[PDB]
Amino acid sequence: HTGGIMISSTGEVRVDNGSFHSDVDVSAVTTQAEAGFLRARGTIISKSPKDQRLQYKFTWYDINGATVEDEGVSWKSLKLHGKQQMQVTALSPNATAVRCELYVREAIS
Amino acid sequence: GGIMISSTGEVRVDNGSFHSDVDVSAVTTQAEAGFLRARGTIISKSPKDQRLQYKFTWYDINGATVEDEGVSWKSLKLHGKQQMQVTALSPNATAVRCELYVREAISN
User: Fold this and answer.
1) How many CB pairs (< 8 A) connect A and B?
2) Residue B24 maps to which CATH number?
3) Where in the sequence is the domain holding B5, given as residue range(s)?
4) Domain count, chain B
5) Where are the transmembrane segments (chain B) (predicted)?
6) Closest-CA distance of chain B to residue A39, Å
């Protein structure tokens, strides 16, 4: 038995695997915060009717591409209801961070 | 089984013995002989050979699809850690934007 996955260049990912169907869009940007800090702003949108549990976290990078130590930050759970959008945010852990990346994980069934 | 998606375009799937990992970039376009050339990069993030399929879809000023007879899903082989640029030319002058789509099958 097989399923399928389709990815778009805009960040949309859909999975269709037997009775399991998900369709989520993930994006993030950094905005300037105070005292030389950045603030990550992410958007996670479901485009499918059934509730979907997922987890997310941001990671941070400096000008060289090195990962910036981010103490006490782990994967956080969300239940996205059908067609719900959620906004997620994180303050940079130190002023050397120039960029963030948002990761989202979901269980395929 | 699970999937991980990133804001920089990575999609990683792990499902029993099935494993895939790729990154799909944003599309850029440029003018070319009265048409637009679309470009995207697909990057392997696995040390093993992968194969997937891709297609470009074109849109007009209002986001209506600009029908492209004949052109559909195409195969692409990616050696471990290889980076491949894929490209398409606009079918006609009403096309102003393009999106790149990538698909694969998953199993157990």
Assistant:
1) 89
2) 2.60.40.3230
3) 1-108
4) 1
5) none
6) 15
